[PDB]
Homo-oligomer: A and B are copies of this chain.
Amino acid sequence: GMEEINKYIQNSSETGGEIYNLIEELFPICRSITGNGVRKTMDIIRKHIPLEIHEVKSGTKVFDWTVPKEWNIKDAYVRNSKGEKVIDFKENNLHVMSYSVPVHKTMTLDELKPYLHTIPGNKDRIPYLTSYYKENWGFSLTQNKFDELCDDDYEVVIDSSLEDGSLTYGEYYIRGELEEEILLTTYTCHPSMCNDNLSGVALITFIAKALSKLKTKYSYRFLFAPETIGSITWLSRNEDKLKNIKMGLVATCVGDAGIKNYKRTKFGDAEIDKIVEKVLMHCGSEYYVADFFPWGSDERQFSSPGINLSVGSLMRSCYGFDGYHTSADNLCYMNKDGLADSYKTYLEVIYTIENNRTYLNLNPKCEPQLGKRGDEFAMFWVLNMSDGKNSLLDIAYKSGMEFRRIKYAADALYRVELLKLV
Contacts and interface: CB of A to CB of B under 8 A. Distances in A.
A64 B380 contact: no
A306 B366 contact: yes
**Which of the listed residues A64, A66, A380, A383 has the most CB atoms from chain B within 10 Å of its own CB?**
A64
Given A65-B369, A235-B366, A369-B65, A386 B133 contact: no
Interface string A363-396: 1111111011000110011011111000000000
Contact of A367 (B301, B369, B380, B386): B301
A361 B65 CA distance: 16
A384 B368 CA distance: 50
A380 B300 contact: yes
A21 interface: no
Contacts of A64: 363, 365-369, 372
A294 B66 contact: no
A366 B307 contact: yes
Contacts of A305: 361, 364, 383-387
Interface string A302-313: 011111000000
Nearest to A372: B64
A381 B296 CA distance: 13
How big is chain A's contact interface, by range? 35 or more
A364 B369 CA distance: 56
A300 B63 contact: no
Interface in A177-234: 228, 231-232
A383 to B, nearest CB: 7
A375 to B, nearest CB: 12
A66 B371 CA distance: 12
A304 B366 contact: yes
A266 interface: yes
Nearest to A381: B294
B300 A363 contact: no
Contact of A304 (B65, B294, B367, B369): B367
A232 B366 contact: yes
Given A305-B361, A371-B133, A385-B305, A63 B380 contact: no
Interface in A54-93: 63-66
A318 to B, nearest CB: 16
Contacts of A65: 366, 369
Contacts of A304: 364-367, 383-384
Interface in A2-42: none
Contacts of A371: 133
Interface string A352-366: 000000000101111
Contact of A300 (B231, B232, B384, B385): B384
B381 A63 contact: no
Given A304-B366, A305-B361, A377 B63 contact: no
Interface in A113-161: 133
Interface in A281-321: 293-295, 300-301, 303-307
A63 B384 contact: no
B365 A235 contact: yes
**Which of the listed residues A232, A366, A383, A387 has the most CB atoms from chain B within 10 Å of its own CB?**
A366
A139 to B, nearest CB: 25
B384 A294 contact: yes
A366 B64 CA distance: 8
16 contacts: A64-B363, A64-B367, A64-B369, A66-B369, A133-B371, A293-B399, A294-B380, A300-B367, A301-B366, A304-B364, A304-B365, A304-B366, A304-B384, A305-B361, A305-B364, A307-B365
Interface of A: 63-66, 133, 228, 231-232, 235-236, 266, 293-295, 300-301, 303-307, 361, 363-369, 371-372, 376-377, 380-381, 383-387, 399
